[PDB]
Design a protein around this motif. Structure first.
Motif, mmCIF file in Angstrom:
data_model
loop_
_atom_site.group_PDB
_atom_site.id
_atom_site.type_symbol
_atom_site.label_atom_id
_atom_site.label_comp_id
_atom_site.label_asym_id
_atom_site.label_seq_id
_atom_site.Cartn_x
_atom_site.Cartn_y
_atom_site.Cartn_z
ATOM 1 N N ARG E 5 -33.912 27.838 -94.300
ATOM 2 C CA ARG E 5 -35.119 28.600 -94.068
ATOM 3 C C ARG E 5 -35.071 30.028 -94.582
ATOM 4 N N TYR E 7 -37.880 32.184 -92.805
ATOM 5 C CA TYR E 7 -38.625 32.744 -91.689
ATOM 6 C C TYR E 7 -37.947 32.546 -90.333
ATOM 7 N N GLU E 8 -38.270 33.376 -89.318
ATOM 8 C CA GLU E 8 -37.398 33.540 -88.162
ATOM 9 C C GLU E 8 -38.006 33.010 -86.872
ATOM 10 N N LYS E 9 -37.140 32.628 -85.913
ATOM 11 C CA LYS E 9 -37.506 32.111 -84.615
ATOM 12 C C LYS E 9 -38.024 33.162 -83.635
ATOM 13 N N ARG E 96 -41.217 27.407 -79.334
ATOM 14 C CA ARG E 96 -40.799 28.266 -80.401
ATOM 15 C C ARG E 96 -41.941 28.438 -81.394
ATOM 16 N N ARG E 98 -42.978 30.697 -85.317
ATOM 17 C CA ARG E 98 -42.350 31.109 -86.555
ATOM 18 C C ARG E 98 -42.954 32.408 -87.067
#
Lengths: 180, 201, 73, 185, 103, 55
Positions: E5, E7-9, E96, E98
């Motif tokens: 990936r 992009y972040e959690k 979660r 993104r």
RNA sequence: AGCCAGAAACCAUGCUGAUUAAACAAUACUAUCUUUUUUGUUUGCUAAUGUAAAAGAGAAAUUAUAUAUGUACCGGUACAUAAAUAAUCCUAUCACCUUUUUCGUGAGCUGAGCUGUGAGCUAGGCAAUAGUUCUUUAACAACAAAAAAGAGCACAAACUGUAG
RNA sequence: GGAUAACUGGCUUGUGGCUGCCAAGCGCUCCUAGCGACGUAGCUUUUUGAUCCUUCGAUGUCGGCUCUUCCUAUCAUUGGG
RNA sequence: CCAUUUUUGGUAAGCAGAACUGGCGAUGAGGGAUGCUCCUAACGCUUGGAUAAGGUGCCUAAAUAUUCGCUCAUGAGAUCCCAUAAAAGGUGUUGGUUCAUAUGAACUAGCCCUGAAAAUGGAUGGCGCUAAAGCGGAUUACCGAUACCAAGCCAUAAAAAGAA
RNA sequence: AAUUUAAUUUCAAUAAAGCAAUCCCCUGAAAUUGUUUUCACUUUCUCCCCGCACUAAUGUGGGGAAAACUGGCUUUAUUUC
């Protein structure tokens, strides 16, 4: 601006007089120093004392001067003695107490903190009569006398209290309260 | 997620804060395994806690105790009951959160391989003054006659000795790894080795 | 850890001269906590290329270390 | 309240002190005595070179200062106990009835029969490490001796309480066994 | 592995609730390593993606998307408000979300 | 208000629910405590009630 | 602060229930049937789909925590090591095929040789682009079909009556 | 018709009931072992009032029996001063 | 009919009767756990903003905030209306103040304690909390109404203004 | 994140000079409707004497001395040290 954060309350020199009249063409001038959070409060406190002491009221007087006082040295320690009259649930009591600070304003802050903490006394119920610098030998209070000794040290008496960033909810290993 | 399971060693923690902090996360949705649940602290004295539990014991449903409140005697269930108190368990979100929490007496073997974490804000000597009276929950449970402590203590010592051999093995292996690592700093490219030294590892 | 004995009051100049004389920052930096802090500060402010270089260097190191461990057997 | 409070606790002569791990321990001629202070806030330190023990507390309060004196008094006793051995002398008073004193379990449990002519048995075992001996010097005296000041005192007290009988007056009913004299050997 | 990936959690919390009172116009996000106001301000204008998997196929895929943007803080310890182009499901609370690095 | 005259309740409360037993066999709820000192031996025996006599 | 003995009170023990725990373990025997791979799951029915959580879901002391842990001596002594702790460590995107060298491990033969698999080093010139982004359809679990391989109780009914 | 009595409940607790503090006396001598005037402070609703908020298109109006549960302000029983 | 202040009768009453004003009634949104009357604030339909009363350990939205005190309770204590507690004590601790000779008296008021008994099981709203999440201050930040500001839209009212 | 010129007992260093030694910036304590005059107060990782290791401490309790390193003021320049 600075970067400075905590603790505020100020010192004011206020001077006033009775309104001029035909009866008295040279009013008595009255001066006082007053510790307050702002100038409007300082004027009101002066007026409360002017009302209690003299028969003068705001409607029968005039302001000659009001100016903020700044302490001579901000970073040199002095022993300030303060005499208070305060009111209990039953009535009135006098006290004269001693505070080590670099500022008279800080000493008043400690005094209000003490009156609130030790007696549950509200700001309304306190009357400050004179705060002045007292010599080291003269001091009555043992808590101030201990500070005034030749040499002083401690092995760190206070728990850590890191920034918000590092106050996270989980720790990897058990910590310690403080280093030896 | 944040992590697969948070596993929590209840030793040295105070009941309320540990439960309260877990509950907000639990609602957020993390599954949390509390281990060594007997070794959690209540901030009251031994007598003070005994008094409170006696009063709790006195509570009953007069017409039929079969449909009455429950006087849970296991320290894990006591913790669970307290966490339920800090949840809206009559809701569907609350029911789900209540299901997510896992509580374990001592150390069970599927979690003895696993890492354990602690909550620094819930530590007793962080948050309770040193001279104040207090009591451990397992001890309190034993005090009001519900002793399952001796078995856990036997289990912990046996497990801890084996673990000690595991820790020495892990330490030994790390020493050897460090020796091999230090050896191979000469074997890599100089410029890259210098960059690796410059920012540390 | 460090302390240098001082007079009753400060003075900014005398403090600056004494601190320069005793080299307290150097001693702090030489001490382990100073090392941990300066390593974190450098690492945080590093570029993407610098970060890749560190990753690349560790990857090189692991290859050599594994080669030694295999050879050692 | 106070910034610093200290105490300097007399040399334990000829004996082996240890302050490690909060459980302060002294060994000597008559025994090894152990006594935890982990719950106390003090920095008890072994001065050692010139002997003595130094107790110091940082930022004390009057309870803590009192604890420093209690601990120093206990240490002084601990030293005394191992050096010279504590003797609690208990005298037996009786207006009439014979009280039969059988020390059993090799000088460790005094069995008492026939207090106030009861025809019933009162058993009192000693606490760990302490002797219950009899007096050859005078008929009614009973020696409770040991290294620990607390175990002998508690054992002697337990012997007194066990004998003493409930109900009606006591003022002319003086009968029983009582601690007379606290000494060392 | 090869699917890595960019992009972040983060975790999508409830709506911007109040005690016994509801606003569904604003959603609350806890952003995974963000634990303070200053750090929440760092990502303040960023586009947010809530990606979810369906019961069965729609057009041909089983993966669907709600789009939003973070827009203002809700606390001092890293709780930030995000506004989405439509109201998000109560089903997805605690899930979660993104966080794209753009703009 | 309080009862005119005082008597305990009829029967034990401690055997409610006074329902049918689950299993026919006289199952031992708890064994006598083991004693390490003693030689190994059986603690129980099943037998059939045949009748009554006097002795 | 630290302790001790001490009551018809209190909790166990004992004893009763435990579809009060929508609870559970061990043992015995059993239902054309079980196992591996491939394709699919875009007359009431007779091919067939579900996830309140994937996205590096990485992480092993231990009593503490007004001091600890090793190591050497005999629970104690001595000597070291940690101490803003995950302010960390681990970590992985060096495609390809071809030239060359080393090492882990499996398999066949009766500890050695070879081959396979995994990891590194060495030399070469070779990949892609869907026209600006519009979820990165990458995880887990279940099933239906296709091939390849595997080994019977209970209820009722009569009889019973220590049960009703 | 609860716009209005007789019943529970409810507020209040005068009255009833219960606990106090004090110290002039009583208690051989002795304020307090036991008491306690003249006073003064509370608690309760186990009495009766005061009351009229609730119910008047019906809450069945005494007592007894039976039967169970809860309280303690402990009468006896246990441990005690 | 309810509240503050003033107030008469009655031991008192959520009792009877007033005065002035404001409410409720006929009217609500947010807070006061909860609640006809307390507080904040009175309402077309919506979006965004910033606040009020009020809070900010978890239930439950915001701080396990900062800063100085005080406080351990074998039934601690926790916010107006609001749902009890007094006289009287206390060699528990904390401040004072008056006196005497670094010690002895006497007072004083803060907290805390005894004084402090009752009917289904039981209630700071609950869990819990004592390096408070208690009590007294002060310092900031954040959350927080349909009110308030800005914008849109609806109707009503009034005003402009019109007879290629 | 800043920013302008004012206002209101701000400073802090820079390196060359001086002045006094509990003395000065200060702040104490004293002798009707005025000023003013008196002596009290710093440091020290300086030295000595007694206690002689007595410490909370790389010290220490008491008695004295020492100085101006330390600090304070007057200056003269200096502000991106």
């Amino acid at each position: 601006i600075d970067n400075s954060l905590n603790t505020n309350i100020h010192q004011y020199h206020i001077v006033g007089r009775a309104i001029p009249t035909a009866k008295d063409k040279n009013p008595n001038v009255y001066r006082m120093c007053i510790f307050a959070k702002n100038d409007t409060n300082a004027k009101s406190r002066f007026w409360y004392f002017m009302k209690k002491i003299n028969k003068l009221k705001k409607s029968n007087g005039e302001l000659l001067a009001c100016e903020q006082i700044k302490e001579r040295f901000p970073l040199r320690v002095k022993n300030y003695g303060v005499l208070l009259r305060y009111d209990s649930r039953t009535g009135t009591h006098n006290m004269y107490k001693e505070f080590r600070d670099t500022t008279k304003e800080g000493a008043i802050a400690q005094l209000y903190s003490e009156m609130a903490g030790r007696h549950r006394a509200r700001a309304s119920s306190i009357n400050i009569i004179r705060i002045s610098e007292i010599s080291s030998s003269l001091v009555r209070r043992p808590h101030i006398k201990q500070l005034l000794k030749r040499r002083l040290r401690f092995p760190a008496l206070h728990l850590p209290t890191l920034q918000k960033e590092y106050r996270k909810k989980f720790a990897s290993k058990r910590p310690s309260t403080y280093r030896m | 997620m944040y992590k697969k399971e948070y596993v929590i060693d209840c030793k040295g923690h105070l009941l309320g804060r540990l439960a309260s902090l877990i509950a907000k996360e639990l609602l957020n949705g993390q599954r949390i395994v509390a281990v060594r649940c007997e070794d959690i602290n209540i901030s009251g004295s031994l007598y003070r806690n005994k008094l409170k539990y006696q009063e709790f014991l006195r509570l009953r449903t007069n017409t039929n105790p079969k449909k009455g409140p429950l006087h849970l005697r296991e320290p894990s269930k006591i913790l669970w009951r307290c966490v339920r108190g800090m949840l809206p368990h009559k809701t569907y979100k609350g029911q789900l959160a209540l299901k997510k929490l896992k509580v374990c007496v001592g150390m069970p073997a599927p979690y003895d391989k696993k890492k354990k974490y602690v909550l620094p804000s819930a530590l007793r000597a962080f948050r309770l003054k040193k001279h104040r009276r207090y009591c451990r929950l397992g001890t309190l449970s034993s005090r009001v006659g519900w002793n399952y402590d001796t078995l856990v203590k036997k289990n912990e010592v046996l497990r801890k000795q084996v673990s000690k051999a595991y820790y020495k093995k892990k330490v030994n292996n790390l020493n050897e790894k460090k020796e091999i690592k230090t050896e191979a700093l000469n074997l890599i490219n100089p410029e890259q080795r210098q960059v690796l030294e410059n920012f540390g590892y | 850890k460090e302390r240098i004995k001082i007079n009753k009051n400060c003075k900014s100049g005398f403090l600056r001269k004494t601190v320069n004389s005793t080299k307290v920052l150097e001693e702090f930096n030489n001490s382990k906590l100073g090392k941990k802090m300066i390593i974190k500060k450098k690492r945080d402010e590093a570029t993407d290329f610098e970060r890749f270089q560190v990753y690349f260097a560790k990857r090189e190191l692991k290859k050599k270390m594994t080669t030694i461990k295999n050879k050692k057997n | 309240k106070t910034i610093v409070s200290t105490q300097k606790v007399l040399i334990p002569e000829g004996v082996k002190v240890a302050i490690n791990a909060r459980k302060v321990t002294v060994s000597g001629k008559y025994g090894t005595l152990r006594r935890s202070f982990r719950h106390l806030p003090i920095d008890i330190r072994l001065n050692k070179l010139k002997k003595y023990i130094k107790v110091v507390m940082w930022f004390g309060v009057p309870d803590s200062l009192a604890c420093i004196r209690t601990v120093c008094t206990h240490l002084k006793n601990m030293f005394t106990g191992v050096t010279k051995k504590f003797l609690y002398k208990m005298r037996l008073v009786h207006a009439h009835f014979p009280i039969n004193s059988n020390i059993v379990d090799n000088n460790t449990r005094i069995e008492i029969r026939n207090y106030l002519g009861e025809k019933s048995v009162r058993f009192v075992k000693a606490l760990p490490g302490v002797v219950i001996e009899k007096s050859p010097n005078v008929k009614d005296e009973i020696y409770v001796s040991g290294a620990d000041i607390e175990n002998v005192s508690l054992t002697a007290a337990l012997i007194h309480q066990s004998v003493l009988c409930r109900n009606k007056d006591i003022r002319k009913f003086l009968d029983g066994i009582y601690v007379s004299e606290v000494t060392t050997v | 592995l090869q699917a890595v990936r960019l992009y972040e959690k983060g975790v999508i919390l409830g709506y911007k609730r109040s005690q016994r009172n509801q606003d569904p116009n604003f959603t609350l996000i806890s952003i995974k390593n963000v634990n303070t106001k200053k750090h929440a301000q760092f990502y303040v204008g960023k586009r947010v993606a809530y990606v979810y998997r369906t019961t069965k196929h729609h057009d041909g895929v089983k993966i669907k998307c709600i789009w939003g943007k973070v827009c203002r803080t809700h606390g001092n310890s890293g709780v930030i408000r995000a506004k989405f182009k439509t109201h998000i499901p109560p089903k997805a609370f605690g899930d979660r979300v993104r966080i794209l690095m753009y703009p | 208000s309080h009862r005119k005259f005082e008597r305990p309740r009829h029967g034990s409360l401690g055997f409610l629910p006074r329902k049918r037993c689950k299993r026919l066999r006289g199952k031992i709820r708890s064994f006598p405590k083991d004693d390490k000192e003693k030689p190994p031996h059986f603690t129980a025996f099943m037998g059939y009630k045949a009748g009554m006599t006097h002795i």
